[PDB]
Paper text:
We obtained crystal co-structures of trimeric AcrBper in the LLT conformation with doxycycline (2.1 Å), fusidic acid (2.3 Å) and levofloxacin (2.7 Å) by soaking pre-grown AcrBper/DARPin crystals in the presence of doxycycline (6.25 mM), fusidic acid (5 mM) or levofloxacin (5 mM), respectively. Like rhodamine 6G, levofloxacin interacts mainly with the hydrophobic side chains of F178, F610 and F628. Despite these obvious physicochemical differences, the AcrBper/levofloxacin co-structure shows the binding of levofloxacin at the same planar level as the binding of rhodamine 6G, albeit slightly shifted towards Y327. The main interaction partners of levofloxacin seem to be the conserved AcrB residues F178 and F628 (F623 in AdeB), as well as F615 (W610 in AdeB). Largely planar, heterocyclic compounds including doxycycline and levofloxacin fit into the DBP groove and upper cave region, interacting efficiently with polar side chains and hydrophobic residues of the Phe-rich area. The shared binding site for levofloxacin with rhodamine 6G that is seen in the AcrB co-structures and supported by the mutational analysis data (except for F136A), does not seem to hold true for AdeB.
Residue numbers in the entry:
A (entry chain B), B (entry chain A): 39 to 329, 569 to 668, 678 to 864
C (entry chain D): 6 to 165
D (entry chain E): 12 to 166
Amino acid sequence: APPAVTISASYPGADAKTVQDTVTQVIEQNMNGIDNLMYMSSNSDSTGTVQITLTFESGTDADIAQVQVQNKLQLAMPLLPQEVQQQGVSVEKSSSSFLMVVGVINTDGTMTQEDISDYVAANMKDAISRTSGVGDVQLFGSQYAMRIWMNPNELNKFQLTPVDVITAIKAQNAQVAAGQLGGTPPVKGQQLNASIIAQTRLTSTEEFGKILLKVNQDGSRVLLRDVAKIELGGENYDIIAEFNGQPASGLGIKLATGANALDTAAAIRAELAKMEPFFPSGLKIVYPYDTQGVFMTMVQLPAGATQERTQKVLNEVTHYYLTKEKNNVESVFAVNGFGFAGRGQNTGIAFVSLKDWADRPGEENKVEAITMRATRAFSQIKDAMVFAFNLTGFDFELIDQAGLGHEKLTQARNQLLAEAAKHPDMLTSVRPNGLEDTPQFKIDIDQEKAQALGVSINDINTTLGAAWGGSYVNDFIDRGRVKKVYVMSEAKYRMLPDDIGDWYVRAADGQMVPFSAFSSSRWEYGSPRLERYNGLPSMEILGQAAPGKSTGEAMELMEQLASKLPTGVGYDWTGMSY
Amino acid sequence: APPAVTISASYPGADAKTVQDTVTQVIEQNMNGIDNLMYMSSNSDSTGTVQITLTFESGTDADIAQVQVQNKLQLAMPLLPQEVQQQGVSVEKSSSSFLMVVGVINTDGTMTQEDISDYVAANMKDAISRTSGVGDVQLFGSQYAMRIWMNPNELNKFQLTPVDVITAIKAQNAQVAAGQLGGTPPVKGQQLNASIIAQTRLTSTEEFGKILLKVNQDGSRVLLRDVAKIELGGENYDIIAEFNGQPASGLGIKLATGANALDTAAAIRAELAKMEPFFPSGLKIVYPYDTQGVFMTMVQLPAGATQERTQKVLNEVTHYYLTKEKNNVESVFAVNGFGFAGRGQNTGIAFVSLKDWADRPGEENKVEAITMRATRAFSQIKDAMVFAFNLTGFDFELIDQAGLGHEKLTQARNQLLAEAAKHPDMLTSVRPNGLEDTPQFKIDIDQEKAQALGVSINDINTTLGAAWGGSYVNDFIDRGRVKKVYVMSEAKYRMLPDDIGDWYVRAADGQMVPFSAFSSSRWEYGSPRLERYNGLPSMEILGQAAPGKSTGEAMELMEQLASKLPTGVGYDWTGMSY
Amino acid sequence: HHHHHGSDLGKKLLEAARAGRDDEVRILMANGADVNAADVVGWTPLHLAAYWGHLEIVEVLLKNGADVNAYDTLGSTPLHLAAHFGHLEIVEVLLKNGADVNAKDDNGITPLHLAANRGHLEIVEVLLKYGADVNAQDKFGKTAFDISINNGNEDLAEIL
Amino acid sequence: SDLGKKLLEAARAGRDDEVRILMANGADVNAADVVGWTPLHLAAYWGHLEIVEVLLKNGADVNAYDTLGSTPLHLAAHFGHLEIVEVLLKNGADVNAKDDNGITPLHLAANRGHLEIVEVLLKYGADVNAQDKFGKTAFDISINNGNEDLAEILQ
């Protein structure tokens, strides 16, 4: 298989196009000077995430390819926004599938799903990350962060905005280098040498709560807890997991390309033994996926599907193995927010572990038959793709060759799909691999009205961005470990459009101005995930041949209806079609 | 062929010494601890360009050499100016000769030289740059940018300055991460989830003209188009190309160190075939240079010669091939502003392709004879070094080893050049390789007058630098591609020294202050290209041995002459003499 | 005019009015699908067809008594969407079926403002023909003439 | 004093048997290091109770203060060493001693939520209306810290 290198970057609170037009394109335009590069693909999603996948020719040294891609991106780093840099970018050589999954549950029930995830990240992830041949570690959850949940009604009562919150957190959660007394060069006769310690980073919600935002004209003081709720919480709330229907976290372990499969695994098991003695009470390590014996179940919902609906499909899948195949299934580790492909609020995956091979006798109880029956039972779940598989059509890319745009490329894609549907004698299941457009909330800042009232645009864009998307301010120390501080609106005040007017920004003359005074909004349709192939906007289309015909004829046909597509629409083969 | 690694940065509007002392020296001081390093040379010219070349021993793994250099460059990246990092520092490992040249013309005359340049850079250059075996791609032109051409009269009319224009473009041509409605963590039971779309990057000249600069107190609006002409235009206007006299553009492609010439040239033709079907009407690909068949004609004028003077020398060169050698010459691809020794207004290059070997019978129609007559015809061109070659000497470096300064290294070079002229029996045509010092405008900012008037230094340096040199602000989207936004004065108001006094800066009290009120100027000389060898200031000197005497005798005489130079001046042998 | 979230056949109609499947839209109407079914943002099948430019679906829904002046969660009518995206024939069929030519959304934005901002000059004449209040102002006080001034569209200023 | 330095490092490290021989050998009970800390200071800082007791019996100045005005009662109240706070107060420590910042041991115990120590301090006559250089009493510290258990002790 051709070695592949993936680049990962994230932009908190950014939509798909913002991410593509600020990160993806800039990285792609600097991927030159790379040897033996076959093709390049990328995704920019409304989660605020980019994954650029560069596939290299066979026989290429994956170490050299990663080094060359790592160095090129290092040069493109100053071209990316500060927010993307603060998140840290990753360049990883690895396969697409997992080598093993390390589950962590809590029998006592003293730790919830959120706490279990924070413990595994704060005490297990990094050491497993440095182990022999582990290329990619995926946390099924999120490490804790100092979450500031702002309330807009209290901020308006004290004439404050999220800009003041972010400014005060950076000032009062600082690690100050203050020098020394009697330091070098010293006056002669000096007998005292001592380090000066000014402000240290905060360590508790109590400390963050008494961050002084401002003092009023009558002497009373406004603390950060007077305008927000200070709690520990995850950096993101995208991914949550469950082991046999009970709260769980874990680590997805991918093998680094070229590493030995088993000896790696034993090394993970070795490091895990070093951790177990210092677990809190109730914490326990389970091994739900060890690469017969195991299989996976993919769950994909259409774009615009929430975690609630995805969780419903996962429960139905988990309930099937735990009830109608309990004689065969030992355990089920289910994750929502993470699918085989990547991340998504509409995706999920379930790692199914079987009982010992000897205890399941006959053809009817082995992984082949169990996956066939499971797929048959999940096939009638409405508005969801649910497949079960262990461990042959075509892979087609529709390319925007002349700067047409996303909307025009969508129409051309639908035109190719409609014509391919009229040939059931040839191609079946012709489908796009990406996502469809979803309603999005377009808001326009009136510059004239903003300037007439004396309201800065950056104050407006920070108030909107930090409240409704979240803002990574700086770092703090949680039990001796560096973690992030996040500023965001409490759930209450960022759920429905009328809440936009609840947010106030301070003008140059001290007047509090609501968002309704200088904004206007409308519903429209945009994309939740934007695909690119070889630097150009693209749309992946999957399909296969009809009963009893070779893909060559299949492929040849697809080429032909692509020729009748509008001017400026190209195409290219990728994957196993290349 | 010794393997070489080249670092290339850019600093718009910067002079040679500004580039040398903020970018070049910083990068050089960290270029130690690199294995198998023979020597290192660098050029810092008033183009706002630095080109550091690192040469290694034969047999050095060019891949590894690049990593080491790149890895040492990271030590200097945070120290470089922001304006330099934003251009994208590049490190590449390639031969210095061109493998081929891909020409692009428009047979229908539908597209201007600028239009053809932008299409090649936006739709063709990147895919060629990512092709395996391609070490470096030189664009004969420049990709379009959103050019804001400021008018200082209209700017002063509304109490505005280029700083205000820059601030408005960052505020109104912004890509905002605005968050979501119903984003995680949501209030339980939330059904609506939509991305929030706020400001998006502008995509047209009409949108940039709409940018509101200010609202007058009476209520009228002053837009960007009211103080500036807005157009699509190149990032720089320093490289123009012609194919047989008609407007054209192209890419100069150098082979990566160690790659196969035939296979890489074939892969480039395969990639060009992927983009031809989607060309605009009239566009066509031509191949004026392929590596007997071909030869080049280098044109180099004195320093200070404008693009006008260089075009006339190129016109005489193209006229010679099109008139007197038309039975043997098929095409001439002339490039103004780019040359053999690099890039500059006073340099040029002509790529000449002969007709087939069969239709040039006789030895006087062969490559050496044609180049032989060409140079002889170009013998008597005034103020121009014009020779032609198909593709004895020594390579001498004069080093300032005691920090004597550039002006004293010039005299030490003249004293050595004069003594080399008195020995024609041994040394023939000993001459420098660089450029001579040219007049330059030295402006002095009176700090006391600036502080007395309330005019900040950053407002002054930004106004002068952006109007007279151009400033890269942020990015915009042109037909689905990320491109730069440049801010500069309209040519009309940055041509004569009296135009300095027409530029105003707003003080803290709000009063407009003309540039004449706090500055003074005088004429002086300064280098338009500063050379450095192994970290220290240098001046390259080249010559060849006399008829019959070997190089070691000429080198021995040069060593003796060089030892009579003033104290602090040293020497070393490079290139062909190492 | 503000319709409520639907069920199943109403969802299939909303999914088909968006994709432009004329045959199934007629099938579902004959089986009693709610012609005024709404999604989470308040868009009816008429909203979706006027957005993506499916003129036949626009006529089939109006045949079955679709609300020509349906409001989404922000006050935008199907005429707002059709005039904003340069769909000429739809703006005709909507106005011919009794669409409010002077309907203002939550911001005071009328179909005249949307057609004026995108430079859809054929649509600005159809709207004016049906009695569009040319001096209508949004929340910021802008008229369609102010839009042309700011945009630099002098063809439009001629028309207005 | 050479013995005084060995006593300071022994009191800092909690070596009670080395401290006893140094006391019997005539070491300076009140030897101070560069910052002005006596052996009673460090034993109170590092919570070595019997070193605090042995020192006081051999005539240790219970109210010695460093270059910034901090007494051993300050350090003991700051670091939750409840038993050491009691023996210091019993041996005549100033309950209302202020450092150069006007800060009292009651402030230090209130700041860190050492409630058991706060009660012992007020039992020995700690001025609860004591203000530091910024005018903040122990009551203001409880309101700012959000410590309601302490805020009702002080009332």
